[PDB]
Amino acid sequence: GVQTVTLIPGDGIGPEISAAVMKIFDAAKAPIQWEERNVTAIQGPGGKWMIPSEAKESMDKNKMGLKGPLKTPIAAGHPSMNLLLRKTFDLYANVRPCVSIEGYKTPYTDVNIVTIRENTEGEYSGIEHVIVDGVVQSIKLITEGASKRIAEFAFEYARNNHRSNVTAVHKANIMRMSDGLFLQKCREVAESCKDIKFNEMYLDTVCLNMVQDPSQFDVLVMPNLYGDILSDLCAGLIGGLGVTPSGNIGANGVAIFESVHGTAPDIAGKDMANPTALLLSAVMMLRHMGLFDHAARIEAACFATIKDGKSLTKDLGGNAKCSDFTEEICRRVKD
Amino acid sequence: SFPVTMLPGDGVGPELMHAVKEVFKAAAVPVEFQEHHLSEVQNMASEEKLEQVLSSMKENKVAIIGKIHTPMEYKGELASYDMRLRRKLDLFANVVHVKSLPGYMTRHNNLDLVIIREQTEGEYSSLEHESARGVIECLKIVTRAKSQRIAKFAFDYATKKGRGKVTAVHKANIMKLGDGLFLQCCEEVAELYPKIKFETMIIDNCCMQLVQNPYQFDVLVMPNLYGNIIDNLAAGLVGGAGVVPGESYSAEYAVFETGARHPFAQAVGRNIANPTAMLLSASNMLRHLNLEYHSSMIADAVKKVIKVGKVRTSDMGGYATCHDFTEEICRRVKDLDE
Ligand SMILES: NC(=O)C1=CN([C@@H]2O[C@H](COP(=O)(O)OP(=O)(O)OC[C@H]3O[C@@H](n4cnc5c(N)ncnc54)[C@H](O)[C@@H]3O)[C@@H](O)[C@H]2O)C=CC1
């Protein structure tokens, strides 16, 4: 068959890479059609900012999505397009795999790390308001429920993808109630399965134990109370933001796949972006979609390109245009 | 001549403290110490013990402290005796010095980077009240008055220590009101010292950049959102909680500690702990006292006993005890007189 999937181009280097990754699928003739649905910040009737109805009905029709990064204003406008986007689809899990690129060497070797971070609670969704002049209060809440829901996802991921350890990153020293709960929910599901080996490290220790040696970490699970400073840290071991993919897995197989790399204003429209992010993002799509062999073809293509070294893009150590990159990878796939 | 309030605390902490005072003995450093032997794991603790601490801080106005060990099985952290102390001194402005040491190779060598974070609110104001059957709520506060404070301190530290750039790591994107305010203040104070480059970085991105290349930075000022993490992440570039000094300042005080102070910072036993953090923080304390001569000596000694490679503790790749590594330093301190 020939499946279809929503596509949000995104803002900035959205078009550059979304065009690039569209064309590797095209070149590779994968059974995907793209239903482009520009989702922009659109005001709400009651002031509760809704979604472009175009993308809201379009995604329910495909239950799948690849998306470029959206733009959030520095202090002047929409709360964020991504937060609202993840929440109004209950994509309760932001899986950030993080593995090396064999041919592209960093100071870190053989790093296979996965951040499973919860995606619909904590600082994602809350009031922040002006209580008096010059004093701001913020009201981030965490639940008992989704705590359990991500800590089940943790062991389920580590169960499908054959993982040794699952370690709960938490800050129960400085937030007794909030993250003391989460452990309790982790602890409960971790007893359910001695299948997977478990522990609990505090967040500051991990970030230190991490830049020292990412050989001690398999899967990580986190409440969205400390956002994903860990996930972007780990994206410094691999290579760059240009090479890390990311996944808003949700229930019922709905998922939006994007990359950590954001709006990228500096190199907007300059044609020096990295398509490796949105690409390996879409290689999660297929491997999530069951299209395993369009996956390993495209994926292993992008690696062998990188290893050869003659076309790797600007942030990877070579003056090579995002376009010329995307066709060395295109040509590479076809035979 | 020069009294310094010394708080050993608990952990391997009291051992390091010893090492600092023994090395001061070797160098003959006209600093005499009042130890306050305050701790909750050993139950030498009350607020009457804290008061005696601050009665000490009124006079000497300058103190070197360890980490007091909160018992997380009953209390938390914002009610630790360590937070309760930090409070009484109106400490703000944590100063962490991320500087690699020549002869301790890491993945981040020749690095020179100082991490200013606000130490009074943000995560440390966490108000937590349960609202439902199982809905926890977390209330956090940001104030223009505590931020205009952290950036004037930051800039005044940039000028005072020769440093030319100052970055403001901020989360304006989603925290549009808390860290919008923080940026507004930072931008405000940022014109006032126009001999200093200023720039803003979203925090998310910065922890990636902090490990993809820390060499792009110099002075980092940030609100206390997210906690003491980034101090600890950077402090790994330079070889760990065994070596990265730290200091915490006040309007009127200066408390000299260690940069990276996670739980199980040094979960070593008898001996077998590194004292480079304490010692490099002692000399920095000494510089504060304008004993620059004795600050030079201690500092330049232990930056070289670890360059020469003969003695090395567990964490730096070596076999020696702490007694052995501190006694190596005395020998090279005693030499440096003549
Ligand atoms: N997924 C999302 O929704 C995200 C959205 N954003 C938003 O977009 C804007 C982005 O801000 P920043 O963090 O400064 O941008 P960013 O995180 O996208 O960083 C781009 C910068 O980092 C490097 N970079 C990142 N990705 C790259 C790539 N693919 N190719 C080449 N270089 C790359 C470049 O040096 C560039 O200057 C912000 O408004 C932010 O809120 C940021 C991150 C993620």
Residue numbers in the entry:
A (entry chain A): 3 to 337
B (entry chain B): 14 to 351
Quoted from the paper:
Human NAD-IDH is a key enzyme in the TCA cycle, which catalyzes the oxidative decarboxylation of ICT into α-KG. The α and β subunits form a heterodimer (αβ), and the α and γ subunits form another heterodimer (αγ), which are assembled into a heterotetramer (α2βγ) and further into a heterooctamer (the heterotetramer and heterooctamer are also called holoenzyme).
Crystals of the αβ heterodimer with the α subunit bound with an NADH at the active site (αNADHβ) also grew at condition II with the protein solution incubated with α-KG and NADH (both 50 mm) before crystallization and belong to space group P21, and the structure was determined at 3.30 Å resolution with each asymmetric unit containing four αNADHβ molecules, which form two dimers of heterodimers via the clasp domains. In this structure, there is clear electron density for an NADH but no electron density for Ca2+ or α-KG at the active site. Unlike the αMg+NADHγNADH structure, in the αNADHβ structure, NADH binds only to the active site and occupies the spatial position of NAD. The αNADHβ structure is almost identical to the αNADβ structure (superposition of the two structures yields an RMSD of 0.5 Å for about 610 Cα atoms). The NADH binding induces almost identical conformational changes of the large domain of the α subunit as the NAD binding, and the NADH retains almost identical interactions with the surrounding residues as the NAD. These results indicate that NADH competes with NAD to bind to the active site of the αβ heterodimer and thus inhibits the activity of the αβ heterodimer. In the αNADβ and αNADHβ structures, most residues of the α and β subunits, including the β2-α2 and β3-α3 loops of the β subunit, are well-defined except a few residues at the N and C termini of the α and β subunits.
